[PDB]
Ligand SMILES: *[C]C1=C([C])[C]=C2C(=[C]1)N([C][C]([O])[C]([O])[C]([O])[C]OP([O])(=O)OP([O])(=O)O[C][C]1O[C](N3[C]=NC4=C3N=[C]N=C4[N])[C]([O])[C]1[O])C1=NC(=O)[N]C(=O)C1=N2[C]/[C]=[C]/N1[C][C][C](/[C]=[C]/C2=[C][C]=C(C(F)(F)F)[C]=[C]2)[C][C]1
């Protein structure tokens with residue numbers, strides 16, 4: 001079975017790579033482990049839900065590559081409901097609000113909160129998107145956990161608790177599990193704190209009509225029989241003139257080049273000849289994925305809207321199974337639903353329960369948070385625990401524990417002879433997202449076009465025109481946000497005055 | 500290819516498991532990925548060295564299982580040279596000493612050092628060897644790195660730098676990479692700080708005559724054609740009556756049970772049907788091995804002994820490629836040599852050099868520390884970088900980053916249907932060592948004997964009589980060591 005390029009993995013990244021190469025007139029094969037394409041995207045269809053995303057779902061302004069690819073495939077977006085009030089639930093009580101950040105009134109707490117978000121972005125600006133290990137304090141920042149950074153930075157428990165939730169929710173891991181440098185990089189390369197946490201004008205603004213799984217499905221339709229399902233790759237041999245790729249089901253593929261479009265650690269499932277170089281050999285043992293269960297509770301009507309709640313709940317407490325929800329009602333206003341994430345250690349703990357037991361705990365939580373008995377009357381439930389997936393390893397993405405990004409980060413997308421590396425983890429803008437998957441797949445594909453002498457080197461990395469359908473409002477700060485003192489800043493001001 | 504038990508991996512753990520099952524009358528097969536047995540042990544033979552251990556080498560008192568297995572296979576030990584003085588090289592000067600711990604003279608630094616070692620053992624006494632996640636403060640300790648703990652505990656740079664060397668040397672990882680709970684467990688389950696760092700009466704007392712690779716080689720000799728070399732396992736299927744195990748070279752093996760005797764993370768190289776349970780699926784992505792280059796420089800004579808130095812060097816600071824050495828001279832006094840470890844980030848950095856460039860750096864360091872121009876005239880050099888091994892992942896062993904041991908530790912030896920788990924990482928005494936490899940292999944084998952109805956549950960875990968050849972002496976402390984205050988302790992008194 002001979003071709004120009006074998007693509008290992010049929011997620012968005014591998015499918016985007018294969019489509020680009022196909023369009024450029026090369027012969028490509030996609031080898032996919034599962035009986036389906038889409039990977040960490042999966043759209044379930046049945047009569048009770050019509051369609052529902054159980055994996056990656058949201059897209060927003062500045063994610064121009066996924067929007068362009070989706071639009072070319074004939075897909076459309078709609079806006080996630082944020083008409084009514086958001087809810088912050090903390091210490092057993094709900095506080096409705098507007099705007100992206102839960103507000104605080106206590107003046108000291110206000111300064112601490114303001115300084116926390118500001119400092120995340122300040123540190124971010126020191127970190128190159130394409131080379132985080134080149135930050136001036138890369139080593140110092142990489143040698144501490146996010147827990148350690150929050151302990152230093154947050155002078156109030158209020159700010160520390162919200163910051164903790166921010167980390168758990170954005171990277172499906174505990175603050176003590178992840179590198180501070182890596183987390184700060186991750187946020188900055190999404191455009192900063194406001195962009196990453198926002199619905200309106202941020203990452204959660206929109207979803208695809210009919211589900212995100214259609215992106216991979218529609219590319220498979222374009223590629224025809226070039227996509228091979230239930231072909232897990234077990235062996236890559238680069239000792240001869242052409243690369244040999246072998247699958248579990250006893251097939252051999254021969255190619256000039258290979259794109260690895262799988263999560264970095266899942267490279268461990270492949271035996272390499274010759275052995276990988278030392279730094280990659282070790283890197284792929286050091287980069288786990290996070291832990292999450294995505295849960296959707298269906299209701300007769302979006303009853304929360306009648307109480308002037310949009311369906312967004314930011315829920316702080318150890319007893320709460322879910323820390324974040326969004327309205328998942330269809331744009332037509334039917335199949336009323338609340339989507340919630342069970343995160344990090346809670347995914348581990350609550351996976352021990354039955355599906356029926358998890359549904360009951362979510363409804364009881366939502367009833368309390370929304371002050372609504374109607375939340376106790378679900379009509380349907382769907383969920384997906386991504387921790388159990390052999391060919392994902394977790395969700396949403398790969399996290400770096402302390403010390404790893406500075407020692408091993410440079411080899412993430414370094415070619416190994418005729419193997420090139422795609423997958424969202426290798427992106428420099430919205431790495432961890434569907435957007436980053438498209439950036440990495442197309443970049444890897446063009447690395448091979450360059451190696452073949454079909455394009456000049458300056459065309460490997462390509463800028464993306466802004467979407468005309470999803471324009472990006474700039475991120476702005478106020479004078480007060482920029483110049484109000486931190487808590488230690490204020491204490492320094494007090495000590496000075498009184499002298 | 501039908502048998503009773505397939506053992507995946509022909510390291511010491513897999514070989515110990517296979518031998519026990521074979522001796523009890525079961526039909527075993529060992530599937531080994533490499534063209535050799537031994538795994539993280541490897542003995543090279545050539546005329547220049549006679550033999551040299553390039554992997555695991557040292558054994559000592561309280562490691563009774565590896566000593567008993569080796570004795571049964573016809574091996575003998577000899578004592579690592581510790582007759583003359585040890586050296587601590589501090590801020591560019593050598594300070595000779597005797598006894599296991601580098602001493603200190605400044606009274607404040609003395610209290611801080613004393614408190615650091617004492618506190619490691621105090622904390623270890625609250626950590627169960629067989630269940631570190633059941634420590635009273637398991638979450639608190641697991642959620643900190645060793646770097647954070649040392650930052651709290653060490654009031655002097657002196658103590659912090661020696662404690663950092665201790666971590667780097669013992670677990671081939673940086674203090675910021677590893678869980679405090681995991682590291683404290685690791686030390687405790689080797690018998691404490693004195694036992695783990697000591698040559699005389701500790702882990703480094705002895706080596707095997709002819710090399711540690713003989714343990715795995717001589718078990719392979721017993722088992723004959725039951726050991727299959729260059730058979731990397733790619734696929735395990737437990738859907739049917741018997742377990743099916745497939746190798747990369749297209750062979751299929753059928754058995755009633757399987758022993759996985761490979762480092763935990765290397766489970767990722769196997770495709771499982773049905774999929775592994777969630778907790779193991781994620782665990783095996785969270786447990787890396789450390790980074791080390793083991794380096795042996797040969798000389799015409801053990802010239803250091805003439806200056807009343809034994810060859811042990813403890814070398815502080817960033818600039819030194821090697822933080823620790825031992826005399827590697829043969830018991831007969833010939834093939835004179837110094838063994839050194841290049842640790843953690845330095846293994847990563849110095850791997851970019853040539854073999855000749857590393858030799859030069861080592862020789863110049865040793866000349867400075869030993870105070871002898873003779874160190875600049877090596878006659879031979881051997882090294883091994885364990886970071887490059889596909890079927891090890893690193894050395895010496897698996898380390899646990901912050902948060903992982905409490906969340907996933909319970910799954911390490913939990914059977915998955917008819918797969919049982921061996922490997923040194925699953926031991927409860929000298930886990931990470933050749934001793935733990937034997938303990939785990941034999942325990943996993945006896946779990947299968949019990950599942951088969953051949954032994955009672957109370958015989959799965961078996962005690963080991965003390966070696967007559969390598970008896971252990973008690974670890975002792977002084978009244979002052981036990982009762983002198985810490986630095987903050989002394990400050991509260993003031
Ligand atoms: C899973 C998931 C989930 C659940 C979710 C999500 C996700 C996920 N995400 C991500 C995505 O999905 C990703 O990135 C992608 O998809 C990726 O792609 P790629 O790279 O392509 O990869 P994959 O898919 O994996 O593919 C691969 C493939 O391959 C294969 N294999 C393997 N192995 C093998 C193979 N083959 C062959 N052979 C071999 N050996 C497989 O099978 C596959 O197929 C996402 N994304 C996006 O975009 N979106 C979304 O949505 C998502 N998701 C999520 C998210 C979430 N979040 C967001 C953010 C938010 C926040 C908010 C806030 C915060 C804070 C606050 C305060 F309060 F504090 F302020 C507020 C708010 C949250 C949520």
Ligand SMILES: *[C]C1=C([C])[C]=C2C(=[C]1)N([C][C]([O])[C]([O])[C]([O])[C]OP([O])(=O)OP([O])(=O)O[C][C]1O[C](N3[C]=NC4=C3N=[C]N=C4[N])[C]([O])[C]1[O])C1=NC(=O)[N]C(=O)C1=N2[C]/[C]=[C]/N1[C][C][C](/[C]=[C]/C2=[C][C]=C(C(F)(F)F)[C]=[C]2)[C][C]1
Nearest residue numbers: 508510511512532538539555556557732894923931932933
């Ligand atoms: C590598 C190494 C080195 C370099 C070294 C060492 C070691 C290592 N070690 C460890 C040992 O070796 C181990 O543990 C063992 O060996 C293990 O075993 P096992 O478990 O059995 O495992 P392995 O071997 O890995 O095997 C496995 C097998 O499998 C196979 N595979 C895979 N995959 C697969 C397979 N097959 C089939 N299929 C598939 N898929 C493979 O291939 C294999 O074969 C050790 N150990 C002992 O015991 N000893 C020794 O010596 C050792 N080594 C080291 C050591 C070091 N050290 C010690 C300690 C000391 C310290 C001292 C001090 C401190 C401190 C101080 C102050 F100053 F601070 F005070 C002083 C002093 C040093 C170091």
